[PDB]
Amino acid sequence: LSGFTVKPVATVYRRIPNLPDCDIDNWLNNVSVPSPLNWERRIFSNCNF
Amino acid sequence: ANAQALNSLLQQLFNKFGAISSSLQEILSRLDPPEAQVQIDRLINGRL
Amino acid sequence: VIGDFNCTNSFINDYNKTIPRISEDVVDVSLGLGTYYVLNRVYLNTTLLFTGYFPKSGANFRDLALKGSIYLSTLWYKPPFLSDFNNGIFSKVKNTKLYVNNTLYSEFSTIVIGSVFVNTSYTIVVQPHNGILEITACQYTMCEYPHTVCKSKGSIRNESWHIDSSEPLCLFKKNFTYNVSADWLYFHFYQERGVFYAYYADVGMPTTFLFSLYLGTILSHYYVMPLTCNAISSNTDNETLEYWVTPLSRRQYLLNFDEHGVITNAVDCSSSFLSEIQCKTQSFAPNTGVYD
Amino acid sequence: INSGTTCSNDLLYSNTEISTGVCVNYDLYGITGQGIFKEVSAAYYNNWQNLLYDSNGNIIGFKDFLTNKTYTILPCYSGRVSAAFYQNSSSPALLYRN
Numbered sequence: 001l002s003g004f005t006v007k008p009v010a011t012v013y014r015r016i017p018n019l020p021d022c023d024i025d026n027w028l029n030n031v032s033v034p035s036p037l038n039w040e041r042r043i044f045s046n047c048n049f
Numbered sequence: 050a051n052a053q054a055l056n057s058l059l060q061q062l063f064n065k066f067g068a069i070s071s072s073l074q075e076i077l078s079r080l081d082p083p084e085a086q087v088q089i090d091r092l093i094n095g096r097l
Numbered sequence: 098v099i100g101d102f103n104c105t106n107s108f109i110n111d112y113n114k115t116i117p118r119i120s121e122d123v124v125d126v127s128l129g130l131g132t133y134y135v136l137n138r139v140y141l142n143t144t145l146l147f148t149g150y151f152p153k154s155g156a157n158f159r160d161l162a163l164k165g166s167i168y169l170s171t172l173w174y175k176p177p178f179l180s181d182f183n184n185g186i187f188s189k190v191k192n193t194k195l196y197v198n199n200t201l202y203s204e205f206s207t208i209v210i211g212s213v214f215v216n217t218s219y220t221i222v223v224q225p226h227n228g229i230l231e232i233t234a235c236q237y238t239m240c241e242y243p244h245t246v247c248k249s250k251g252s253i254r255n256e257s258w259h260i261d262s263s264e265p266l267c268l269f270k271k272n273f274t275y276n277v278s279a280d281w282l283y284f285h286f287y288q289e290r291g292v293f294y295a296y297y298a299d300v301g302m303p304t305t306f307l308f309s310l311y312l313g314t315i316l317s318h319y320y321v322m323p324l325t326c327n328a329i330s331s332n333t334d335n336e337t338l339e340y341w342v343t344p345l346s347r348r349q350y351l352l353n354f355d356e357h358g359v360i361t362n363a364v365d366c367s368s369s370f371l372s373e374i375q376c377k378t379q380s381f382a383p384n385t386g387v388y389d
Numbered sequence: 390i391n392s393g394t395t396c397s398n399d400l401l402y403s404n405t406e407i408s409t410g411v412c413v414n415y416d417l418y419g420i421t422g423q424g425i426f427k428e429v430s431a432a433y434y435n436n437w438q439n440l441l442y443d444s445n446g447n448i449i450g451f452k453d454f455l456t457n458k459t460y461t462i463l464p465c466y467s468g469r470v471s472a473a474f475y476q477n478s479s480s481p482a483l484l485y486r487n
């Protein structure tokens with residue numbers, strides 16, 4: 001008779017990243033709170049968050 | 050002699066026969082249905 | 098000329114001969130020199146007939162060291178110093194270990210791979226540092242006369258090979274480590290169906306995988322930046338820079354893996370008549386018979 | 390939007406947990422297929438090796454970089470039943486070989 005086949009679920013995905021993380025939590029947890037007049041700006045690019 | 054004949058036929062599933070790859074799951078995951086039949090036809094005509 | 102952006106107009110000396118000296122040794126693959134492990138695959142107690150990009154046995158290298166001085170030149174940025182990246186190259190760099198101020202520092206030249214070396218294209222730069230290897234492939238802005246300086250006992254110049262305000266749209270950025278107290282280094286760079294590969298070794302005959310990146314473009318140019326320093330001259334220490342390069346081609350090899358997964362022997366299938374029989378039967382000890 | 394090289398990892402890292410005993414698909418390091426996993430003690434992996442292959446070219450194991458564990462991939466069952474049926478019977482006799 002015909003072959004019995006099933007459709008599995010819950011696939012697995014794995015891949016090694018090639019770009020470093022953005023690391024925003026450490027920058028937002030800085031002990032130095034800037035004044036509203038300063039509002040220091042830092043730009044994040046080509047990273048993972 | 051029987052073992053060599055069965056192992057040679059088993060390796061035919063890893064050949065490309067001109068296609069982009071040998072696994073049908075990779076073809077059906079990186080190409081659209083309209084342009085995917087041209088790649089599967091090369092694997093069917095080669096394995097048969 | 099490398100880039101299309103004027104960056105400096107400092108002193109320039111006369112265009113000397115700068116002959117690309119040829120090495121006296123040949124490539125020997127009887128122990129593993131020239132072969133590399135697979136990307137992320139492990140083979141145990143088996144023999145594999147790999148069809149990859151390996152250097153041809155019995156061939157000489159060509160030096161590309163461009164150790165500069167207080168002056169520079171315009172012929173260094175011209176062929177044959179800028180070869181054609183047809184299929185790949187094989188590097189063999191000497192670990193220039195200095196002992197300035199009783200400190201063991203390891204510095205040597207870099208390698209740049211690109212297609213047109215402009216902003217709308219991707220340029221792969223592998224610049225070594227003190228005990229840390231850096232690899233970035235972004236859309237840098239190449240200068241007309243790029244060069245690098247030395248950290249320990251710096252020159253009277255400043256390293257300036259790219260000028261940008263913000264970081265461009267990069268595709269790969271990662272650091273690697275290497276042994277500082279080493280003797281020789283080996284590398285592997287080649288392309289296949291668009292994607293790019295890279296290897297590196299510090300000890301042993303084979304090399305280890307670094308990364309695999311997809312670009313979609315066919316890069317066919319590579320150039321080695323000079324090393325402007327004032328510590329490897331005649332009056333200074335007798336250390337000399339070396340950077341050997343030999344072309345690669347698609348050829349079949351036979352690798353042997355022991356019970357642990359270390360390459361023990363390797364033979365080139367297009368070297369002699371005996372090696373042709375080994376790659377046909379896939380064994381280092383062929384049987385008795387007549388082979389065509 | 391929908392450009393650049395700054396993405397988020399809120400899709401591929403959904404569960405980050407694998408089972409051992411059931412058949413499920415996998416996309417480990419660009420390799421696609423199906424199989425069954427099984428925990429095993431392996432000490433032949435290096436700092437740059439993550440997959441295990443045989444001479445024929447099939448993956449028979451891997452190593453996860455998030456938990457530092459080694460497994461073994463085995464092909465999942467896909468067989469065929471041989472049934473014998475009489476002339477004017479109502480249900481054939483089934484036989485699952487091996």
Ligand SMILES: *[C@@H]1O[C@H](CO)[C@@H](O[C@@H]2O[C@H](CO)[C@@H](O)[C@H](O)[C@H]2NC(C)=O)[C@H](O)[C@H]1NC(C)=O
Nearest residue numbers: 019020226227229230231232233270271272273
């Ligand atoms: C890889 O290594 C390089 C070299 O150490 C790192 O670049 C340093 O970054 C810090 C922080 O921005 C600077 O203070 C240093 O001046 C940089 N060094 C050099 C030589 O430029 C880099 O951050 C490391 N990581 C990555 C992802 O590249």
Ligand SMILES: *[C@@H]1O[C@H](CO)[C@@H](O)[C@H](O)[C@H]1NC(C)=O
Nearest residue numbers: 141142143144354355356357
């Ligand atoms: C390696 O393979 C040989 C040849 O089949 C065999 O005799 C030997 O027992 C194997 N060793 C191990 C550790 O599997």
Ligand SMILES: *[C@@H]1O[C@H](CO)[C@@H](O)[C@H](O)[C@H]1NC(C)=O
Nearest residue numbers: 275276277278279280299300
């Ligand atoms: C680095 O090389 C030195 C000698 O070349 C050796 O003694 C040392 O063990 C090596 N270290 C590593 C981490 O390989």
Ligand SMILES: *[C@@H]1O[C@H](CO)[C@@H](O)[C@H](O)[C@H]1NC(C)=O
Nearest residue numbers: 435436453454455456457458
């Ligand atoms: C796995 O082992 C390596 C080397 O021992 C270690 O650097 C890494 O942190 C380990 N992974 C985890 C998740 O602990």
